[PDB]
């Protein structure tokens with residue numbers, strides 16, 4: 001059986017891995033998941049990578065595929081939500097109020113950088129930049145970013161203590177005890193973090209829609225819920 005090829009936002013690593021396994025247990029159909037920034041995956045799909053299912057960490061990259069005729073609106077829907085958090089290495093004693101003018105910048109110390117997803121394209125980066133701008137803190141850190149290929153690459157910098165602070169999703173923090181949540185960004189400091197899922201129009205896999213539909217079922221939802229995602 002040809003596996004269902006799922007391209008999933010980096011932040012979906014453990015949950016979609018668990019989901020892939022559970023789906024195959026239930027149906028006998030293997031699921032092969034590729035993770036990267038949602039931007040990277042969407043671009044790869046647009047350029048003809050043979051994916052069956054796409055899950056983005058934001059609306060924009062799903063819109064991107066839709067506008068290119070690769071996703072039909074009927075075959076897309078919102079699945080998950082998240083929060084945006086400021087994290088530090090687990091052993092860090094930093095206390096930071098993201099609303100306080102210059103507090104994020106000061107917490108970077110003399111030469112530290114703020115680990116973020118690449119802000120122009122990586123959903124976690126663009127949510128972070130939106131939050132930082134909304135809170136008036138962007139200029140104080142915009143030359144002090146450690147822009148990373150995905151939210152999980154950002155998380156890894158913080159886990160290693162190579163960035164004293166980073167901006168990741170709540171679920172990322174839950175996924176890595178080597179970081180700690182210093183603060184949660186106000187929900188209204190950025191667009192709602194929403195993960196749309198879609199069957200790709202060009203998919204020939206007989207299980208593509210089945211897999212997407214299955215993500216709505218209790219045990220599939222429970223994976224994401226256990227892992228700290230909200231359910232749409």
Ligand code: MOO
Pocket residue numbers: 009010011012036037038039056057058117122123124125149150151152
């Ligand atoms: O597409 Mo991500 O889960 O913001 O790196």
